[PDB]
Amino acid sequence: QDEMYMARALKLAARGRFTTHPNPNVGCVIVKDGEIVGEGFHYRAGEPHAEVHALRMAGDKAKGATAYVTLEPCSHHTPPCCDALIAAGVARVVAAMQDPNPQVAGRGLYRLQQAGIDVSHGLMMNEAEALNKGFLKRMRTGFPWIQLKMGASLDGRTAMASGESQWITSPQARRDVQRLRAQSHAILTSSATVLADDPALTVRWQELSADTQALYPQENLRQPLRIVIDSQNRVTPEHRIIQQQGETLFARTHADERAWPDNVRTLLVPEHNGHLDLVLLMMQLGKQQVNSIWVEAGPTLAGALLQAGLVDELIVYIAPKLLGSDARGLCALPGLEKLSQAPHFKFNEIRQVGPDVCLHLTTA
Amino acid sequence: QDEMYMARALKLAARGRFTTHPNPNVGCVIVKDGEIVGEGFHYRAGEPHAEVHALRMAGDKAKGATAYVTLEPCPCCDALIAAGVARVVAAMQDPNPAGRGLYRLQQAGIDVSHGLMMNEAEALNKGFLKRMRTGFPWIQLKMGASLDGRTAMASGESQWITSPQARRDVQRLRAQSHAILTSSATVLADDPALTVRWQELSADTQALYPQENLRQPLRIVIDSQNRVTPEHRIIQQQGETLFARTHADERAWPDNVRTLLVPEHNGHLDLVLLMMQLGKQQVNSIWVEAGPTLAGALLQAGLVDELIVYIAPKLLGSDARGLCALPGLPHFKFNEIRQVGPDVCLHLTTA
Ligand SMILES: Nc1nc2c(ncn2[C@@H]2O[C@H](COP(=O)(O)OP(=O)(O)O)[C@@H](O)[C@H]2O)c(=O)[nH]1
Ligand SMILES: [Cl-]
Ligand SMILES: [Cl-]
Ligand SMILES: [Zn+2]
Ligand SMILES: [Zn+2]
Numbered sequence: 001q002d003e004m005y006m007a008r009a010l011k012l013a014a015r016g017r018f019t020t021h022p023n024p025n026v027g028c029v030i031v032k033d034g035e036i037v038g039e040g041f042h043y044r045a046g047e048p049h050a051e052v053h054a055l056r057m058a059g060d061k062a063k064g065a066t067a068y069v070t071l072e073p074c075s076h077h078t079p080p081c082c083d084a085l086i087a088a089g090v091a092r093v094v095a096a097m098q099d100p101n102p103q104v105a106g107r108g109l110y111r112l113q114q115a116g117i118d119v120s121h122g123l124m125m126n127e128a129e130a131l132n133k134g135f136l137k138r139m140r141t142g143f144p145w146i147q148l149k150m151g152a153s154l155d156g157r158t159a160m161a162s163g164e165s166q167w168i169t170s171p172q173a174r175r176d177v178q179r180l181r182a183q184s185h186a187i188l189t190s191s192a193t194v195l196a197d198d199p200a201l202t203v204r205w206q207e208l209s210a211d212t213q214a215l216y217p218q219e220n221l222r223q224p225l226r227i228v229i230d231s232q233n234r235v236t237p238e239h240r241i242i243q244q245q246g247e248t249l250f251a252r253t254h255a256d257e258r259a260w261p262d263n264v265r266t267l268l269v270p271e272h273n274g275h276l277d278l279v280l281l282m283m284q285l286g287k288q289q290v291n292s293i294w295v296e297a298g299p300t301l302a303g304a305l306l307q308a309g310l311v312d313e314l315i316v317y318i319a320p321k322l323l324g325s326d327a328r329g330l331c332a333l334p335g336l337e338k339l340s341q342a343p344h345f346k347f348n349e350i351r352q353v354g355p356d357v358c359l360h361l362t363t364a
Numbered sequence: 365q366d367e368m369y370m371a372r373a374l375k376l377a378a379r380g381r382f383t384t385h386p387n388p389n390v391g392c393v394i395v396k397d398g399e400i401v402g403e404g405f406h407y408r409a410g411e412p413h414a415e416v417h418a419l420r421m422a423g424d425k426a427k428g429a430t431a432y433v434t435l436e437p438c439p440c441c442d443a444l445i446a447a448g449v450a451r452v453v454a455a456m457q458d459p460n461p462a463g464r465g466l467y468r469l470q471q472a473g474i475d476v477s478h479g480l481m482m483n484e485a486e487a488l489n490k491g492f493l494k495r496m497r498t499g500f501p502w503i504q505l506k507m508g509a510s511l512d513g514r515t516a517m518a519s520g521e522s523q524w525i526t527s528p529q530a531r532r533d534v535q536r537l538r539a540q541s542h543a544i545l546t547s548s549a550t551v552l553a554d555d556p557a558l559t560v561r562w563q564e565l566s567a568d569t570q571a572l573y574p575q576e577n578l579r580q581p582l583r584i585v586i587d588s589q590n591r592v593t594p595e596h597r598i599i600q601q602q603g604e605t606l607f608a609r610t611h612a613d614e615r616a617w618p619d620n621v622r623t624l625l626v627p628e629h630n631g632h633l634d635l636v637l638l639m640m641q642l643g644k645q646q647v648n649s650i651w652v653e654a655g656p657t658l659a660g661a662l663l664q665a666g667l668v669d670e671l672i673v674y675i676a677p678k679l680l681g682s683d684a685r686g687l688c689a690l691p692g693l694p695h696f697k698f699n700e701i702r703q704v705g706p707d708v709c710l711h712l713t714t715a
Contacts, residue, residue, distance in 0.1 A: 152512070152513070153513070154513065154696070154710075154712070155509070155513035155686060155688060156509065156511070156512035156513020156514060156686075157513060157686075160693075299682055303681075314511075318710075320695065320697050320698055320712055320715065321694060321695055322663060322687070322688055322690065322694040322696075323690075323693075324660075324686075324688070324689075324690035324693050325656050325685075325687065325688060325689045325690060326686075326690075328682070329512055329513075329514075329683075330511070330512035330513070330679065330682065331512060331681070331682065332681065332682050333680075333681040333682075336517075336679075336680065336681040336684075337517065337518065337519060338517060338519065338521060339510075339521050339522075339523070339525060339678070339680055339684075342678045342679055342680050342681075343678065343679050344677065345511070345677035345678070346706070347703065347706070347708055350701055350703070350708055352701070355697055356698075357698055357701055357710070359511075359675075359708070361511070361677055
């Protein structure tokens with residue numbers, strides 16, 4: 001019945017997923033007497049909301065029209081979306097889900113019911129929830145959504161005994177990582193990897209599939225915040241990661257006394273044993289409005305995040321190669337000497353990416 | 365049009381994939397005036413062929429009918445002519461030295477054709493076609509590991525990384541393999557039985573396999589230094605056991621135990637020659653359950669045709685035992701990936 005318009009609405013909402021952070025993905029569909037007369041989605045932060053975009057396009061035809069929104073309309077003064085709907089005289093509003101704030105939820109929808117509008121909530125809620133896993137987790141929990149990525153060979157190895165980790169996964173796999181990088185609020189790495197590989201960890205618009213490039217105009221490329229974990233300030237100001245377009249954040253235990261570019265700032269995290277308290281680092285990040293973190297780490301940091309229980313999702317790319325028994329493993333799990341204490345997961349989705357396969361796992 | 369019948373005979377042909385060895389899988393459908401009056405598939409080696417099974421079904425109605433066979437008829441060719449049939453359709457030619465069977469019909473007034481769903485027919489006897497073409501069996505390497513390619517821990521536990529669902533899947537893949545190969549190293553560590561357990565076959569597969577009809581795959585143990593003893597489980601089981609020895613053991617073994625003498629090469633057993641001799645013994649397909657040392661050795665020899673990988677959603681750590689030991693340093697391609705319980709199974713062919 002209504003499912004076509006909402007589905008269209010969430011498809012519209014996904015158009016903003018590369019540039020919407022720290023705001024979520026929202027799409028608006030306005031139908032009057034069975035004909036769409038308004039469409040919009042949120043694109044950047046501080047820019048016009050989705051419902052406003054669609055009301056501005058619908059104009060006079062919004063009177064007595066139904067509005068499909070992927071979330072509860074903004075209910076607080078930019079002037080709030082919930083009142084703009086009233087100003088335009090929409091007679092019916094369908095929202096896929098409510099606000100994630102524990103108290104603010106339902107406020108907007110009530111205000112329309114108080115002003116005589118038809119309101120309902122929950123239609124395609126699960127699809128709406130999946131569009132904003134990071135934001136919703138940060139709005140409910142203090143913590144962001146964490147994506148641990150791993151790219152290995154069939155036998156679980158990430159680099160040969162020579163250290164040649166240079167491109168064991170497929171070029172299609174690298175394009176797939178670029179897409180998932182591009183919609184990530186932030187990218188996280190350890191100093192162990194920075195010293196070993198001296199990486200860029202920047203979203204390279206060139207190596208993006210053209211389907212995405214048709215939705216991501218290059219001039220609006222948002223470079224995700226780069227977070228480097230350096231509890232002992234081993235990274236130097238001459239490493240590639242810091243002299244890159246976009247901003248770099250260093251999780252340090254004490255301030256480094258050298259001079260750094262303006263696009264580099266330092267976050268001080270308290271210490272646990274000999275290093276940062278990783279959970280606390282995730283906490284402060286949540287307090288700074290970071291929705292989702294894409295983790296590009298070697299075996300050490302991957303083992304840490306798992307052993308701390310900070311991983312919400314495992315993304316594993318497997319290449320159809322056998323890389324030998326003496327090649328570097330996937331993650332370092334100290335004290336794991338019996339397999340009953342091994343970490344346990346659940347396969348959500350398995351998909352083909354060129355000659356590779358990509359495995360999506362959840363903790364439980 | 366006639367593809368609908370070839371597909372029927374292919375489905376029939378698969379019905380004996382469990383008991384057919386060393387013979388291939390073949391199905392036959394005879395249609396006359398739009399009705400399949402004859403059906404059959406080969407079931408057991410030494411039992412009647414499929415074309416005969418189908419001709420016995422069609423009887424007098426076989427006259428002036430059309431035969432769809434998944435492989436060129438063998439002889440099965442004469443009973444075809446003796447039954448008065450025109451227009452034989454064959455999925456593929458025989459990989460034996462070949463088209464003689466088609467000639468016996470081409471020049472005897474019968475119409476012929478070749479190639480209909482040829483790829484699907486070739487997929488149903490991967491071992492038999494390879495052996496008839498190269499003299500070598502089709503080699504399936506099974507691997508079951510955690511998410512980080514780990515089998516067992518540094519202690520050597522390995523105790524149920526894979527699901528019970530994945531074990532039952534293995535038994536299904538074991539039960540259609542001609543033979544099952546392992547190394548002495550695995551025999552000494554686990555004292556395994558390496559038997560197809562009808563009790564461990566999922567009810568989907570048990571529908572096909574009747575319990576009283578169970579054909580145990582030939583068991584092959586590579587024991588190049590004769591370290592397995594006749595007290596081990598594997599020799600005290602139903603069916604034959606073949607030992608790939610380098611020099612003949614002098615002990616007394618059960619009647620079902622026999623040895624195969626393989627030339628050495630640079631002090632170790634020559635795996636390539638072993639396969640070559642095993643083809644002479646008519647072994648179509650080999651299911652390989654092996655630890656890191658044997659598995660890498662087959663791969664490095666280039667003898668692995670197919671990888672079967674079960675992955676469990678666990679991590680064992682980077683110091684736990686790996687999958688294949690590759691001294692000196694293999695490329696594949698994913699054919700089928702599928703879910704088996706909480707694990708996934710990946711099917712890879714040499715690429
Ligand atoms: N300073 C720093 N910290 C790291 C690096 N790699 C990982 N980490 C973090 O610091 C710890 C590294 O592991 P380790 O010092 O042996 O402690 P463990 O993880 O508790 O065994 C983990 O908690 C990681 O989260 C690195 O290169 N530099
Ligand atoms: Cl990079
Ligand atoms: Cl067993
Ligand atoms: Zn709003
Ligand atoms: Zn025959």
